[PDB]
Design an enzyme around this catalytic site. Structure first.
Site, PDB file in Angstrom:
ATOM      1  N   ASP A 134       0.826  -1.180   0.000  1.00 57.03           N
ATOM      2  CA  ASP A 134       0.000   0.000   0.000  1.00 57.03           C
ATOM      3  C   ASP A 134       0.875   1.251   0.000  1.00 57.03           C
ATOM      4  O   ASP A 134       1.442   1.611   1.019  1.00 57.03           O
ATOM      5  CB  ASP A 134      -0.931  -0.072   1.227  1.00 57.03           C
ATOM      6  CG  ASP A 134      -2.016   0.990   1.205  1.00 57.03           C
ATOM      7  OD1 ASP A 134      -2.772   1.063   2.209  1.00 57.03           O
ATOM      8  OD2 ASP A 134      -2.109   1.754   0.188  1.00 57.03           O
ATOM      9  N   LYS A 136      -0.118   4.339  -0.547  1.00 53.10           N
ATOM     10  CA  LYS A 136      -0.848   5.562  -0.227  1.00 53.10           C
ATOM     11  C   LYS A 136       0.118   6.587   0.393  1.00 53.10           C
ATOM     12  O   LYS A 136       1.054   6.218   1.115  1.00 53.10           O
ATOM     13  CB  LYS A 136      -2.026   5.289   0.743  1.00 53.10           C
ATOM     14  CG  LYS A 136      -1.641   4.631   2.060  1.00 53.10           C
ATOM     15  CD  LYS A 136      -2.926   4.380   2.925  1.00 53.10           C
ATOM     16  CE  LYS A 136      -2.591   3.760   4.274  1.00 53.10           C
ATOM     17  NZ  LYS A 136      -3.856   3.464   5.016  1.00 53.10           N
ATOM     18  N   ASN A 139       1.612   6.555   3.980  1.00 47.52           N
ATOM     19  CA  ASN A 139       2.588   5.519   4.320  1.00 47.52           C
ATOM     20  C   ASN A 139       4.026   5.917   3.977  1.00 47.52           C
ATOM     21  O   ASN A 139       4.965   5.226   4.341  1.00 47.52           O
ATOM     22  CB  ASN A 139       2.236   4.194   3.624  1.00 47.52           C
ATOM     23  CG  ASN A 139       1.126   3.460   4.342  1.00 47.52           C
ATOM     24  OD1 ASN A 139       0.588   3.957   5.319  1.00 47.52           O
ATOM     25  ND2 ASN A 139       0.781   2.287   3.864  1.00 47.52           N
TER      26      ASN A 139
END
Ligand SMILES: CCc1cncnc1N1CCN(Cc2nc3cc(C(F)(F)F)ccc3[nH]2)CC1
Ligand SMILES: [Zn+2]
Length: 291
Positions: A134, A136, A139
């Site tokens: 992930d 995103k 992060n």
């Protein structure tokens, strides 16, 4: 002998269902005064779940094994009768998400810089058989100079936990590959999808497949009908098309070359990979300098 009283609690950087992240100051031993980040996990909220205990052990093992300029460093790890402690390097540059919120849309050269550093962290992980899953913007953190730092390797940070089977649906799914959402099985090709979603978000102001609710969003990701805005450069559009493909095995980066395939794309033609890894390229934003 590293123990909880070796560190002074300064402030809370994050609070979740599983515990907290603190900024801390080492008060004993050689490093006295040195600032770190400390993650404190509630044992009793983990010990019952099987996949959560496994993920807790995996974060510990990954961070200790990995040493890379674009991945957050683990300094110490210890346990008490009720808590797990991870002492990580303190990163002062905030989240990549904050820079994107400030700017609305990145210029291509700005996006290129972050995506290029990320591709290296991603390549390193894949060499070690690790999948990020992930990418995103929240992060990805920035160090004090403004260089990229990958940092979510452990438990879901949320407080509510969508269902109690997995942690896929707890946060945003807008950067996750279709096969993750279908749970049909997946591999490192997932990271290149996600690099594509982050790229699209940086260059357009929003992720590629967003719907009104979670079900319509999922449906858009599975359908994978990419809308390329016509004002992106020819190079940016060509890379996006190649990253955001439904079929995992045909994505750029999915072959035997991995990061090498993505790094050789014309979008990255102005990047010197030895100087980038060495952090001799100036970042587009220097958080210490910002207000
Ligand atoms: C430790 C790396 C870091 C370094 N330097 C400055 N900031 C950092 N972080 C990186 C992680 N970030 C998001 C976050 N992760 C979390 C994990 C939890 C958990 F306890 F696992 F449930 C709880 C809240 C959380 N919030 C908070 C600040
Ligand atoms: Zn969760």
């Amino acid at each position: 002998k590293i123990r909880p009283e070796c560190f002074e609690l300064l402030r809370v950087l994050g609070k979740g269902g599983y515990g907290k992240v603190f900024q801390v100051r080492k008060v004993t031993g050689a490093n006295t005064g040195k600032i770190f980040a400390m993650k404190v996990l509630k044992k009793a909220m983990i010990v019952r779940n099987a996949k959560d205990t496994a993920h807790t052990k995996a974060e510990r093992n990954i961070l200790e094994e990995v040493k890379h300029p674009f991945i957050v460093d683990l300094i110490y790890a210890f346990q008490t009768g009720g808590k797990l402690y991870l002492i990580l390097e303190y990163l002062s540059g905030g989240e990549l998400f904050m820079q994107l919120e400030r700017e609305g849309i990145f210029m291509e050269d700005t996006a290129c810089f972050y995506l290029a550093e990320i591709s290296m962290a991603l390549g390193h992980l894949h060499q070690k058989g690790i999948i990020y899953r992930d990418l995103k913007p929240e992060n990805i953190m920035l160090n004090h100079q403004g260089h990229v730092k990958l940092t979510d390797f452990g438990l879901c940070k949320e407080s509510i936990h969508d269902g109690t089977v997995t942690h896929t649906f707890c946060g945003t799914i807008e950067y996750m590959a279709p096969e993750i959402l279908m749970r049909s099985g997946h591999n490192r090709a997932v990271d290149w999808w996600s690099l594509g979603a982050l790229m699209y978000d940086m260059l357009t102001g929003a992720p590629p497949f967003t719907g009104e609710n979670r079900k319509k969003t999922i449906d858009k990701i599975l359908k994978c009908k990419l809308n390329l805005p016509p004002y992106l450069t020819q190079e940016a559009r060509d890379l996006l098309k190649k990253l955001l493909k439904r079929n995992a095995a045909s994505r750029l980066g999915a072959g035997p070359g991995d990061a090498g395939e993505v790094q050789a794309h014309p979008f990255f033609r102005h990047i010197n990979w030895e100087e980038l890894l060495a952090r001799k390229v100036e970042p587009p934003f220097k958080p210490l300098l910002q207000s």
